């Protein structure tokens, strides 16, 4: 029935997302392991992830549906293995750009993971099994983040061994990706709804918030490494990341439980949470104390999770199961276009080339402007 294609997929989602080395990425790269500078990391290497992901989004989206999901999941496993092999052994900036490209391929393939269950599970086990597949990956994420800090601070393991552990995790994640059943059907090819205007409003807010959050998460660790360099101070990235994820999870559940007529309160809550995210980013920027920087991050992630859960609820409440894939694909594509434009303008060496110390001022202003744009038409 719906068990085997759900246990296998959830084990894949768990082991793939349990990567203890992700929290300490910047401390690993800029340390004696790789000798990369902060300026290079922030202005030549990291921007490549946005570009490769943007380029590979749509082709992967079409390929998944034509090829019926599993082979794309297998490709994602292979990309995990290659990315972490390069991250372990690859050296220099020229290889880190390739690493970023392969990680962009990894992220783009996430479509063929979440959508696979729909093609092989009945429709009376769709509603719930979606929750299992989300929760398993989220729990894996938090567990990996907690394990990273536990090991680093109570065992004294260098950041290289965290990457070794992450590679060992993704290798086993790939193994469970060969065992799924091949779907006998698919959504569109083996089987314009935006005409609704309110869906367009919710999609715009979803896309803008996702772009801003994806940029901030991409360039947060560099801020922590500049305010408290790992070379001579205690760094608490794993625990902060775990607590931020747990706060986001509690926020997502709380929004799901509390019953409120979102047709009236959705815009107000979205504005309030955008203002909270702007203020928290400004606090995370200006303050020299590191602990205030962690607290600002935590507040940012929790508020963003509340905002995004409200936005997702409003969009998906009227759409069929079939339209979900296409609608969210277009919404993430617009998000990536926006993210690429802003990355090129701000961070890229072919643009302003701002350092991490001033980037977050721009990001805070961006979130404040997102909040303020929707509030107009107040007299007359």
């Amino acid at each position, epitope marked *: 029935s719906w068990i085997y294609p759900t246990v296998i997929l959830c084990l894949f989602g768990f082991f793939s997302m349990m990567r203890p080395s992700e929290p300490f990425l910047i401390p690993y790269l800029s340390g004696p392991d790789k000798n*990369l*500078t902060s300026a*290079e990391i922030t202005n030549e290497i990291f921007p490549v992830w946005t570009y490769s992901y943007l380029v590979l989004l749509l082709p992967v989206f079409v390929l998944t549906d034509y090829v019926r999901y599993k082979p794309v999941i297998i490709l994602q496993g292979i990309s995990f293995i290659i990315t972490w092999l390069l991250l372990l052994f690859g*050296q220099g900036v020229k290889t880190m750009q390739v690493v970023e490209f392969f990680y962009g391929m990894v992220t783009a393939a996430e479509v063929a993971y979440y959508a696979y269950i729909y093609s092989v599970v009945s429709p009376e086990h769709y509603q719930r099994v979606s929750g299992y597949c989300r929760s398993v990956t989220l729990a894996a994420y938090t567990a990996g983040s907690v394990l990273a800090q536990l090991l680093v601070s109570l065992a004294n393991m260098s950041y290289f061994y965290l990457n070794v552990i992450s590679l060992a995790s993704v290798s086993v994640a790939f193994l469970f990706s060969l065992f799924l059943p091949m779907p006998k059907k698919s959504m569109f090819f083996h089987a314009e709804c935006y005409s609704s205007k309110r869906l367009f409003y919710w999609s715009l807010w979803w896309a803008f918030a996702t772009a801003g959050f994806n940029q901030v998460l991409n360039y947060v660790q560099i801020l922590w490494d500049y305010k408290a360099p790992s070379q001579d101070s205690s760094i608490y990235n794993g625990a902060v990341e775990a607590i931020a994820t747990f706060g986001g999870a509690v926020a997502a559940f709380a929004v799901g439980y509390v019953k409120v007529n979102w047709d009236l309160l959705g815009e107000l809550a979205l504005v309030v949470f955008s203002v909270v995210n702007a203020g928290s980013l400004f606090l995370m920027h200006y303050t020299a104390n590191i602990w205030a920087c962690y607290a600002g991050y935590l507040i940012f992630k929790s508020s963003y999770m509340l905002l995004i859960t409200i936005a997702v609820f409003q969009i998906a409440v009227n759409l069929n199961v079939e339209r979900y894939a296409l609608v969210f694909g277009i919404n993430t594509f617009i998000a990536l276009v926006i993210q690429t434009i802003m990355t090129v303008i701000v961070v890229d060496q*072919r*643009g302003l080339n701002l350092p991490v110390s001033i980037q977050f001022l721009v990001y805070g202003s961006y979130f404040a402007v997102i909040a303020g744009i929707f509030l107009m038409r107040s007299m007359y």
Partner: nanobody, 126 residues
Framework: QVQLVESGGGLVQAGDSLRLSCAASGRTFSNYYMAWFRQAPGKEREFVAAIRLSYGSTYYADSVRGRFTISKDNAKNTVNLRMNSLKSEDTAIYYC???????????????????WGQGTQVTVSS
């Protein structure tokens, strides 16, 4: 015109260390890049390192990353390049060049820099 002056290059024993210095002059340098390029006989001009004097950002070429280290002596304007563990491949002539910090600057492109110094050999003999 902005006058640049390298100083501190010469013979050095293979595997041992040396420090080059580019005593820039003739203008204010609070908004300037300052990068070192080299030209071994028979090869093209190569990028070696760069420093953004405003934010202090530093870039390095993968052939020297970890071995060389570039720092600014602000009180004197004399940018320095410290070469540690020079290897036989480091024989070259080293130039220090500068460019006004502006939008869309390609740090690693030798055609970006408006001002060049007369150079000074670093004969890394073995």
């Amino acid at each position: 015109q902005v006058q640049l002056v390298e100083s501190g290059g010469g013979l050095v024993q293979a595997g041992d260390s040396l420090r080059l210095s580019c005593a820039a002059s003739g203008r204010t340098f609070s908004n300037y890049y300052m990068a070192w390029f080299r030209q071994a006989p028979g090869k093209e001009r190569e990028f070696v390192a760069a420093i953004r004097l405003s934010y202090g950002s530093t870039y390095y070429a993968d052939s020297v990353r970890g071995r060389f280290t570039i720092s600014k002596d602000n009180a004197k304007n004399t940018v320095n390049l410290r070469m540690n563990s020079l290897k036989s491949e480091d024989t070259a002539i080293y130039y220090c060049a500068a460019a006004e910090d502006r939008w869309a600057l390609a740090v690693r492109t030798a055609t970006t820099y408006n001002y060049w110094g007369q150079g000074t050999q670093v004969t890394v003999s073995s």
